[PDB]
């Protein structure tokens, strides 16, 4: 069937220009300097991808000898719902298990090789949807972000539509402001962390 040039397995990237604002959701948070947003307008386009991925992976007779290289994109079956997602191979955890990052969501896990499928270039036409972000204007007031600061950040953005504003482009991410416009005096995630002690200015 499909003979794939791995040169043709280039994932696409959302163009986020400085000054772009979009309505999105904070999908996954490591710290205020390491988190992921998705564009709210992605819900349908992504449910569509997921349907295509499910259809495609079901036609693969999932028998063995698939060993992706570090950095390949492939399909990974998420442990919590058993659905198929796009995933970057980050590292092998053993001979038979791999650390993978879900490139449309921002989370990660270690999976059996039995839960990975190769991908084809048709399924890379959607740009990767998890936008890697660093929160503008703040540094951790101890030099390390404490799980309490992170908790608070999670609380400010959970189940909420957030305005993400691109302040700058970094090498592998976007520097952003996060602004909840659902409170009539608008609230910056940066400002609340500064006001609460956890952050200091830069």
């Amino acid at each position: 069937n499909i003979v794939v040039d791995k040169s043709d397995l280039i994932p696409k990237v959302l163009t986020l220009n400085v000054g772009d604002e979009f309505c999105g959701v904070v999908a996954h948070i490591q710290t205020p300097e390491d988190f992921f947003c998705q564009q709210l307008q992605s819900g349908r386009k992504l449910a569509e991808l997921q349907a295509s991925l499910s259809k495609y992976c079901d036609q693969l007779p999932p028998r063995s000898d698939f060993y992706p290289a570090i950095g390949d994109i492939c399909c990974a079956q998420f442990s919590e719902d058993d659905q198929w997602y796009r995933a970057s191979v980050l590292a092998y955890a053993s001979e038979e298990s791999v650390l993978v990052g879900y490139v449309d969501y921002g989370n990660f896990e270690i999976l059996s090789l039995m839960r990975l499928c190769p991908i084809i270039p048709k399924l890379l036409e959607l740009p990767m949807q998890a936008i890697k972000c660093v929160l503008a204007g703040v540094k951790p007031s101890l030099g390390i972000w404490t799980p309490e600061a992170i908790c608070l950040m999670k609380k400010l953005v959970q189940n909420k539509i957030i305005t993400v504003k691109v302040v700058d482009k970094l090498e592998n991410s976007s520097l952003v402001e996060l602004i909840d416009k659902s409170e009539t005096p608008h609230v910056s995630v940066s400002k609340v962390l500064l006001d609460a002690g956890f952050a200091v200015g830069e």
Binding site: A47, Q50, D81, D82, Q83, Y105
Partner: peptide, 4 residues
Amino acid sequence: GRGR
């Protein structure tokens, strides 16, 4: 959220 997502699907299943």
